[PDB]
Protein backbone atom coordinates (compact mmCIF):
# COMPACT_ATOMS: atom_id res chain seq x y z
CA UNK A 1 0.00 0.00 0.00
CA UNK A 2 2.54 2.68 -1.16
CA UNK A 3 2.80 5.87 0.91
CA UNK A 4 1.73 8.83 -1.14
CA UNK A 5 4.76 11.11 -1.54
CA UNK A 6 3.68 12.64 -4.91
CA UNK A 7 1.89 15.68 -3.43
CA UNK A 8 5.34 16.91 -2.49
CA UNK A 9 6.43 16.62 -6.10
CA UNK A 10 3.61 18.88 -7.34
CA UNK A 11 3.27 22.63 -6.69
CA UNK A 12 4.94 25.43 -4.72
CA UNK A 13 6.19 24.23 -1.31
CA UNK A 14 5.13 26.62 1.46
CA UNK A 15 7.39 28.86 3.49
CA UNK A 16 8.78 27.35 6.67
CA UNK A 17 6.12 28.80 8.95
CA UNK A 18 3.43 27.27 6.79
CA UNK A 19 5.23 23.92 6.77
CA UNK A 20 3.19 21.28 4.94
CA UNK A 21 2.44 18.11 6.85
CA UNK A 22 2.17 14.60 5.48
CA UNK A 23 0.92 11.95 7.89
CA UNK A 24 1.46 8.31 6.87
CA UNK A 25 0.02 5.54 8.92
CA UNK A 26 -0.61 2.17 7.27
CA UNK A 27 1.60 1.70 4.26
CA UNK A 28 4.88 0.74 2.68
CA UNK A 29 7.37 3.47 1.89
CA UNK A 30 10.60 3.74 -0.08
CA UNK A 31 12.23 6.79 1.52
CA UNK A 32 15.67 6.13 0.08
CA UNK A 33 13.86 6.44 -3.34
CA UNK A 34 12.19 9.78 -2.63
CA UNK A 35 15.54 11.29 -1.62
CA UNK A 36 16.90 10.12 -4.95
CA UNK A 37 14.75 12.69 -6.73
CA UNK A 38 16.65 15.40 -4.85
CA UNK A 39 20.21 16.54 -4.31
CA UNK A 40 20.49 15.96 -0.56
CA UNK A 41 22.86 18.49 0.98
CA UNK A 42 22.19 17.80 4.64
CA UNK A 43 20.60 14.81 6.40
CA UNK A 44 20.72 15.10 10.20
CA UNK A 45 18.89 12.93 12.73
CA UNK A 46 18.17 12.72 16.44
CA UNK A 47 17.44 9.47 18.36
CA UNK A 48 17.72 7.74 15.03
CA UNK A 49 20.23 7.52 12.20
CA UNK A 50 19.77 8.18 8.49
CA UNK A 51 20.30 4.46 7.86
CA UNK A 52 17.81 3.39 10.54
CA UNK A 53 15.25 6.07 9.63
CA UNK A 54 14.94 4.52 6.17
CA UNK A 55 14.98 0.94 7.55
CA UNK A 56 12.67 0.69 10.56
CA UNK A 57 8.88 0.06 10.97
CA UNK A 58 6.74 2.77 12.63
CA UNK A 59 3.22 3.21 14.02
CA UNK A 60 3.21 6.73 12.52
CA UNK A 61 5.44 8.71 10.13
CA UNK A 62 5.30 12.49 9.75
CA UNK A 63 6.94 14.31 6.85
CA UNK A 64 7.05 18.10 6.92
CA UNK A 65 8.24 19.95 3.84
CA UNK A 66 8.79 23.58 2.85
CA UNK A 67 10.97 25.93 0.87
CA UNK A 68 14.03 26.65 2.90
CA UNK A 69 17.31 28.27 1.89
CA UNK A 70 20.55 26.26 2.24
CA UNK A 71 22.15 29.46 3.44
CA UNK A 72 20.20 29.11 6.69
CA UNK A 73 21.38 25.54 7.42
CA UNK A 74 22.49 26.46 10.95
CA UNK A 75 19.01 27.78 11.78
CA UNK A 76 17.46 24.41 11.10
CA UNK A 77 18.72 21.82 13.63
CA UNK A 78 17.53 20.51 17.00
CA UNK A 79 20.19 22.57 18.86
CA UNK A 80 19.63 25.87 17.00
CA UNK A 81 18.43 28.80 19.15
CA UNK A 82 17.56 30.76 16.04
CA UNK A 83 14.41 32.44 14.80
CA UNK A 84 13.23 29.33 12.86
CA UNK A 85 12.79 26.98 15.81
CA UNK A 86 11.70 29.92 17.86
CA UNK A 87 8.90 31.23 15.63
CA UNK A 88 8.43 29.11 12.52
CA UNK A 89 8.90 25.39 12.99
CA UNK A 90 9.93 23.26 15.92
CA UNK A 91 9.75 19.49 15.85
CA UNK A 92 9.23 17.28 18.85
CA UNK A 93 12.19 16.59 21.07
CA UNK A 94 10.68 13.41 22.46
CA UNK A 95 10.08 11.53 19.22
CA UNK A 96 13.08 10.45 17.15
CA UNK A 97 13.67 13.05 14.48
CA UNK A 98 15.22 13.86 11.12
CA UNK A 99 16.08 17.01 9.20
CA UNK A 100 16.89 16.99 5.47
CA UNK A 101 18.00 19.93 3.32
CA UNK A 102 17.72 19.14 -0.37
CA UNK A 103 17.71 20.81 -3.76
CA UNK A 104 15.37 20.11 -6.58
CA UNK A 105 17.52 19.55 -9.73
CA UNK A 106 16.68 20.52 -13.34
CA UNK A 107 15.60 16.84 -13.60
CA UNK A 108 12.39 17.38 -11.57
CA UNK A 109 10.27 20.14 -13.12
CA UNK A 110 6.83 19.94 -11.50
CA UNK A 111 7.74 21.86 -8.38
CA UNK A 112 6.88 25.51 -8.87
CA UNK A 113 9.00 28.10 -7.06
CA UNK A 114 7.94 30.82 -4.62
CA UNK A 115 9.07 34.37 -5.23
CA UNK A 116 11.56 34.22 -2.35
CA UNK A 117 12.27 32.52 1.01
CA UNK A 118 10.40 33.97 4.00
CA UNK A 119 10.38 33.32 7.68
CA UNK A 120 8.84 34.96 10.72
CA UNK A 121 11.65 36.63 12.64
CA UNK A 122 9.64 37.94 15.54
CA UNK A 123 6.18 37.09 16.86
CA UNK A 124 4.66 38.67 19.95
CA UNK A 125 1.45 39.46 21.75
CA UNK A 126 0.91 42.94 23.15
CA UNK A 127 -1.31 42.28 26.11
CA UNK A 128 -4.33 44.50 26.66
CA UNK A 129 -2.92 46.19 29.78
CA UNK A 130 -0.88 48.15 27.19
CA UNK A 131 2.53 47.45 28.57
CA UNK A 132 3.44 43.77 28.31
CA UNK A 133 5.07 41.98 25.38
CA UNK A 134 4.81 38.17 25.39
CA UNK A 135 6.84 36.42 22.63
CA UNK A 136 4.78 33.71 20.95
CA UNK A 137 7.23 30.82 20.80
CA UNK A 138 6.09 28.08 18.45
CA UNK A 139 5.21 24.73 20.04
CA UNK A 140 6.34 21.51 18.46
CA UNK A 141 4.04 20.08 15.78
CA UNK A 142 2.19 23.41 15.49
CA UNK A 143 2.03 26.71 13.68
CA UNK A 144 2.92 30.10 14.97
CA UNK A 145 -0.09 32.22 16.00
CA UNK A 146 1.22 34.68 13.43
CA UNK A 147 0.43 32.53 10.47
CA UNK A 148 -2.93 34.36 10.37
CA UNK A 149 -1.44 37.80 9.87
CA UNK A 150 1.57 36.94 7.72
CA UNK A 151 1.23 36.46 3.90
CA UNK A 152 2.00 33.13 2.19
CA UNK A 153 5.36 34.66 1.35
CA UNK A 154 6.68 37.87 2.98
CA UNK A 155 6.63 40.66 0.42
CA UNK A 156 9.61 42.69 1.40
CA UNK A 157 12.26 42.11 3.96
CA UNK A 158 11.30 44.43 6.74
CA UNK A 159 7.55 43.94 6.55
CA UNK A 160 5.86 44.44 9.92
CA UNK A 161 2.51 42.92 10.73
CA UNK A 162 0.11 44.15 13.39
CA UNK A 163 -3.37 42.94 14.19
CA UNK A 164 -5.89 43.86 16.82
CA UNK A 165 -7.50 41.01 18.66
CA UNK A 166 -11.11 40.70 19.73
CA UNK A 167 -11.76 40.42 23.44
CA UNK A 168 -12.49 36.75 22.63
CA UNK A 169 -8.95 36.17 21.29
CA UNK A 170 -7.38 37.76 24.41
CA UNK A 171 -7.80 41.37 23.50
CA UNK A 172 -4.40 42.81 22.82
CA UNK A 173 -2.56 43.06 19.58
CA UNK A 174 -0.83 40.26 17.73
CA UNK A 175 2.33 41.63 16.19
CA UNK A 176 4.93 40.09 13.86
CA UNK A 177 7.87 40.74 11.58
CA UNK A 178 9.20 38.74 8.62
CA UNK A 179 12.55 38.47 6.85
CA UNK A 180 13.37 37.36 3.32
CA UNK A 181 16.19 35.52 1.65
CA UNK A 182 16.56 35.96 -2.10
CA UNK A 183 15.41 33.12 -4.36
CA UNK A 184 18.18 30.76 -5.60
CA UNK A 185 18.77 29.34 -9.06
CA UNK A 186 17.32 25.93 -8.18
CA UNK A 187 14.80 25.58 -5.36
CA UNK A 188 16.15 24.46 -1.96
CA UNK A 189 13.92 22.76 0.62
CA UNK A 190 13.85 21.43 4.17
CA UNK A 191 12.24 18.14 5.18
CA UNK A 192 11.42 17.23 8.72
CA UNK A 193 10.75 13.59 9.55
CA UNK A 194 9.06 12.50 12.80
CA UNK A 195 8.46 8.82 13.69
CA UNK A 196 6.51 7.18 16.48
CA UNK A 197 7.01 3.60 17.57
CA UNK A 198 5.02 1.01 19.53
CA UNK A 199 3.00 -0.11 21.13
CA UNK A 200 2.16 -3.24 19.03
CA UNK A 201 1.24 -1.39 15.90
CA UNK A 202 4.28 -0.62 13.75
CA UNK A 203 2.67 -0.82 10.30
CA UNK A 204 4.53 1.83 8.30
CA UNK A 205 7.25 -0.59 7.28
CA UNK A 206 9.31 -0.15 4.16
CA UNK A 207 8.94 -1.90 0.80
Amino acid sequence: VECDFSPLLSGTPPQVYNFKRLVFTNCNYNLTKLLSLFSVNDFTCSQISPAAIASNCYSSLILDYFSYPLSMKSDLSVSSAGPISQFNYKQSFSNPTCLILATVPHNLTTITKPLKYSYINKCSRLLSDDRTEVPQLVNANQYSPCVSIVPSTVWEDGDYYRKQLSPLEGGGWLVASGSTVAMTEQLQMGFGITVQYGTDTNSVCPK
Partner: antibody, heavy 120, light 107 residues
Framework: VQLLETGGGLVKPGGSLRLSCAAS????????MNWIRQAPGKGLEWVAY????????NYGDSVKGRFTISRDHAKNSLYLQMNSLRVEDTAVYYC??????????????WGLGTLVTVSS | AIRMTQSPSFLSASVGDRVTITCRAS??????LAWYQQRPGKAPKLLIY???NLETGVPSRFSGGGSGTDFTLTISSLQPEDIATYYC????????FGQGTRLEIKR
Protein backbone atom coordinates in the same frame (compact mmCIF):
# COMPACT_ATOMS: atom_id res chain seq x y z
CA VAL B 1 -4.96 63.29 4.04
CA GLN B 2 -5.33 63.92 0.31
CA LEU B 3 -3.97 62.23 -2.85
CA LEU B 4 -3.82 64.32 -6.02
CA GLU B 5 -3.00 62.59 -9.29
CA THR B 6 -1.77 64.37 -12.36
CA GLY B 7 0.19 64.03 -15.54
CA GLY B 8 -2.21 61.98 -17.58
CA GLY B 9 -3.70 62.65 -20.95
CA LEU B 10 -3.40 61.63 -24.57
CA VAL B 11 -0.17 59.92 -25.61
CA LYS B 12 0.63 58.08 -28.85
CA PRO B 13 1.31 54.33 -28.76
CA GLY B 14 5.02 53.77 -28.19
CA GLY B 15 5.09 57.02 -26.18
CA SER B 16 5.77 58.02 -22.55
CA LEU B 17 4.24 59.64 -19.49
CA ARG B 18 5.23 60.56 -15.99
CA LEU B 19 2.14 60.60 -13.79
CA SER B 20 2.67 62.29 -10.43
CA CYS B 21 0.90 62.06 -7.09
CA ALA B 22 1.22 64.86 -4.53
CA ALA B 23 0.56 63.53 -1.06
CA SER B 24 -0.32 65.34 2.14
CA UNK B 25 -1.52 64.59 5.67
CA UNK B 26 1.06 61.78 5.91
CA UNK B 27 4.49 61.04 4.50
CA UNK B 28 5.33 58.54 1.73
CA UNK B 29 8.14 56.09 2.43
CA UNK B 30 6.36 55.37 5.71
CA UNK B 31 3.68 53.57 3.80
CA UNK B 32 3.50 51.16 0.91
CA MET B 33 2.43 53.24 -2.07
CA ASN B 34 0.69 51.66 -4.97
CA TRP B 35 -0.70 52.34 -8.40
CA ILE B 36 -4.03 50.86 -9.48
CA ARG B 37 -5.56 51.19 -12.95
CA GLN B 38 -9.05 50.85 -14.42
CA ALA B 39 -9.80 50.65 -18.15
CA PRO B 40 -12.92 52.51 -19.21
CA GLY B 41 -15.99 50.48 -18.18
CA LYS B 42 -13.80 47.60 -17.01
CA GLY B 43 -12.61 46.42 -13.55
CA LEU B 44 -9.54 47.13 -11.36
CA GLU B 45 -5.89 45.99 -11.94
CA TRP B 46 -2.90 46.52 -9.60
CA VAL B 47 0.18 47.81 -11.47
CA ALA B 48 3.02 48.46 -8.97
CA TYR B 49 4.06 49.07 -5.42
CA UNK B 50 7.04 50.86 -3.96
CA UNK B 51 7.54 49.32 -0.53
CA UNK B 52 7.56 51.35 2.70
CA UNK B 53 10.66 52.71 4.38
CA UNK B 54 13.46 51.48 2.00
CA UNK B 55 11.59 51.59 -1.32
CA UNK B 56 11.53 48.12 -2.91
CA UNK B 57 9.36 47.88 -5.97
CA ASN B 58 7.42 45.27 -7.88
CA TYR B 59 4.98 45.24 -10.79
CA GLY B 60 2.12 43.58 -12.68
CA ASP B 61 2.92 40.99 -15.37
CA SER B 62 1.35 43.09 -18.09
CA VAL B 63 3.44 46.16 -17.30
CA LYS B 64 6.79 44.75 -16.10
CA GLY B 65 9.96 46.41 -17.43
CA ARG B 66 8.01 49.21 -19.11
CA PHE B 67 6.52 51.00 -16.10
CA THR B 68 8.68 52.29 -13.26
CA ILE B 69 7.46 53.43 -9.85
CA SER B 70 9.59 56.10 -8.13
CA ARG B 71 9.35 58.51 -5.25
CA ASP B 72 10.80 61.64 -3.64
CA HIS B 73 11.19 62.15 0.15
CA ALA B 74 10.92 65.95 -0.10
CA LYS B 75 8.04 67.20 -2.28
CA ASN B 76 6.24 64.07 -0.89
CA SER B 77 5.49 62.82 -4.38
CA LEU B 78 5.02 59.53 -6.20
CA TYR B 79 5.80 58.71 -9.78
CA LEU B 80 4.83 56.19 -12.36
CA GLN B 81 6.93 56.35 -15.49
CA MET B 82 5.10 54.60 -18.30
CA ASN B 83 7.14 53.76 -21.40
CA SER B 84 6.43 51.84 -24.59
CA LEU B 85 2.75 52.48 -23.87
CA ARG B 86 0.10 50.26 -25.45
CA VAL B 87 -3.45 50.76 -26.65
CA GLU B 88 -4.35 48.31 -23.85
CA ASP B 89 -2.72 50.62 -21.27
CA THR B 90 -5.63 53.03 -21.61
CA ALA B 91 -7.11 53.53 -18.16
CA VAL B 92 -7.69 55.78 -15.20
CA TYR B 93 -4.60 55.53 -12.97
CA TYR B 94 -5.19 55.70 -9.23
CA CYS B 95 -2.49 56.60 -6.76
CA UNK B 96 -3.17 54.56 -3.65
CA UNK B 97 -1.58 54.27 -0.17
CA UNK B 98 -1.25 51.39 2.37
CA UNK B 99 -3.81 51.52 5.17
CA UNK B 100 -1.16 51.63 7.89
CA UNK B 101 2.58 52.13 8.71
CA UNK B 102 2.98 48.40 8.78
CA UNK B 103 2.27 46.17 5.82
CA UNK B 104 -1.42 46.16 5.11
CA UNK B 105 -2.35 45.16 1.57
CA UNK B 106 -5.61 47.09 1.26
CA UNK B 107 -6.38 50.80 0.89
CA UNK B 108 -8.71 53.33 2.44
CA UNK B 109 -7.14 56.27 0.66
CA TRP B 110 -7.45 56.58 -3.10
CA GLY B 111 -6.75 59.62 -5.21
CA LEU B 112 -9.40 60.99 -7.60
CA GLY B 113 -7.44 59.41 -10.46
CA THR B 114 -6.04 60.55 -13.80
CA LEU B 115 -7.02 59.36 -17.30
CA VAL B 116 -4.44 58.08 -19.75
CA THR B 117 -5.58 57.57 -23.33
CA VAL B 118 -3.32 55.72 -25.79
CA SER B 119 -3.99 55.93 -29.52
CA SER B 120 -2.99 57.45 -32.82
CA ALA C 1 -1.54 35.40 -11.02
CA ILE C 2 -4.14 34.50 -8.36
CA ARG C 3 -7.62 34.70 -9.92
CA MET C 4 -10.50 36.19 -7.96
CA THR C 5 -13.82 34.92 -9.24
CA GLN C 6 -16.71 37.09 -8.24
CA SER C 7 -20.44 36.32 -8.65
CA PRO C 8 -23.08 37.29 -9.63
CA SER C 9 -21.78 39.79 -12.20
CA PHE C 10 -24.90 41.94 -11.71
CA LEU C 11 -27.77 41.72 -9.32
CA SER C 12 -31.02 43.53 -8.56
CA ALA C 13 -32.92 43.73 -5.26
CA SER C 14 -35.44 46.10 -3.62
CA VAL C 15 -34.82 48.25 -0.55
CA GLY C 16 -34.52 46.24 2.66
CA ASP C 17 -33.30 43.09 0.97
CA ARG C 18 -30.28 40.97 1.77
CA VAL C 19 -27.73 40.66 -0.99
CA THR C 20 -24.81 38.25 -1.08
CA ILE C 21 -21.78 38.68 -3.32
CA THR C 22 -19.34 35.85 -3.54
CA CYS C 23 -15.60 35.67 -4.20
CA ARG C 24 -13.41 32.57 -4.90
CA ALA C 25 -9.63 32.44 -4.97
CA SER C 26 -7.65 29.97 -7.09
CA UNK C 27 -5.55 29.25 -3.99
CA UNK C 28 -5.73 29.63 -0.19
CA UNK C 29 -5.41 33.32 0.71
CA UNK C 30 -5.98 33.09 4.43
CA UNK C 31 -8.47 35.88 5.18
CA UNK C 32 -6.27 38.36 3.22
CA LEU C 33 -9.19 39.77 1.28
CA ALA C 34 -10.75 43.24 1.03
CA TRP C 35 -14.09 44.47 -0.32
CA TYR C 36 -14.50 47.80 -2.08
CA GLN C 37 -17.54 49.83 -3.18
CA GLN C 38 -17.31 52.00 -6.26
CA ARG C 39 -20.22 54.41 -6.63
CA PRO C 40 -20.88 55.73 -10.19
CA GLY C 41 -17.98 57.98 -11.19
CA LYS C 42 -15.69 57.76 -8.13
CA ALA C 43 -12.72 56.06 -6.55
CA PRO C 44 -13.52 52.83 -4.67
CA LYS C 45 -14.37 53.12 -0.98
CA LEU C 46 -12.98 50.57 1.45
CA LEU C 47 -15.73 48.51 3.10
CA ILE C 48 -14.13 45.37 4.56
CA TYR C 49 -10.52 44.50 5.31
CA UNK C 50 -9.49 41.29 6.99
CA UNK C 51 -11.94 38.85 5.55
CA UNK C 52 -14.63 40.11 7.89
CA ASN C 53 -13.39 43.44 9.36
CA LEU C 54 -15.61 46.51 9.03
CA GLU C 55 -13.71 49.69 8.15
CA THR C 56 -14.90 52.46 10.52
CA GLY C 57 -17.53 54.72 9.00
CA VAL C 58 -19.30 52.06 6.97
CA PRO C 59 -22.81 51.18 8.26
CA SER C 60 -23.07 47.82 10.11
CA ARG C 61 -25.44 46.46 7.42
CA PHE C 62 -22.25 45.51 5.50
CA SER C 63 -20.63 42.32 6.71
CA GLY C 64 -17.82 40.21 5.34
CA GLY C 65 -17.13 36.58 6.08
CA GLY C 66 -15.16 33.62 4.82
CA SER C 67 -11.54 32.45 4.87
CA GLY C 68 -9.26 30.14 2.90
CA THR C 69 -10.65 30.29 -0.61
CA ASP C 70 -14.37 31.23 -0.27
CA PHE C 71 -15.71 34.63 0.84
CA THR C 72 -19.00 36.58 0.91
CA LEU C 73 -19.89 40.24 1.18
CA THR C 74 -23.34 40.62 2.53
CA ILE C 75 -25.29 43.87 2.46
CA SER C 76 -28.45 43.12 4.43
CA SER C 77 -31.14 45.89 4.57
CA LEU C 78 -30.29 47.31 1.18
CA GLN C 79 -30.58 51.05 0.86
CA PRO C 80 -30.90 53.29 -2.25
CA GLU C 81 -27.36 54.67 -1.88
CA ASP C 82 -25.84 51.21 -1.98
CA ILE C 83 -25.91 51.35 -5.84
CA ALA C 84 -22.38 50.69 -7.03
CA THR C 85 -19.90 48.18 -8.25
CA TYR C 86 -18.35 45.93 -5.59
CA TYR C 87 -14.88 44.54 -5.98
CA CYS C 88 -12.94 42.03 -3.94
CA UNK C 89 -9.16 42.11 -3.62
CA UNK C 90 -6.67 39.56 -2.35
CA UNK C 91 -3.46 40.86 -0.84
CA UNK C 92 -1.73 37.53 -0.07
CA UNK C 93 0.41 37.75 -3.17
CA UNK C 94 0.82 40.69 -5.56
CA UNK C 95 -2.77 42.11 -5.50
CA UNK C 96 -5.55 40.90 -7.81
CA PHE C 97 -9.24 41.98 -8.00
CA GLY C 98 -12.60 40.32 -8.62
CA GLN C 99 -14.21 41.12 -11.95
CA GLY C 100 -16.96 43.21 -10.40
CA THR C 101 -20.59 43.03 -9.23
CA ARG C 102 -23.13 45.76 -10.12
CA LEU C 103 -25.87 46.27 -7.63
CA GLU C 104 -29.09 47.70 -8.94
CA ILE C 105 -31.92 48.86 -6.70
CA LYS C 106 -35.48 47.87 -7.56
CA ARG C 107 -38.11 50.52 -7.33
Amino acid sequence: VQLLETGGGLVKPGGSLRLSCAASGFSLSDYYMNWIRQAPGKGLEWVAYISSSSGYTNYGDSVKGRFTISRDHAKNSLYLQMNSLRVEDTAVYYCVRDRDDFWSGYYKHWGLGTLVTVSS
Amino acid sequence: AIRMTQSPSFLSASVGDRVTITCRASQDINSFLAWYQQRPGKAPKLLIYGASNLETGVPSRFSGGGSGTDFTLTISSLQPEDIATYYCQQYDKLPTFGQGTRLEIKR
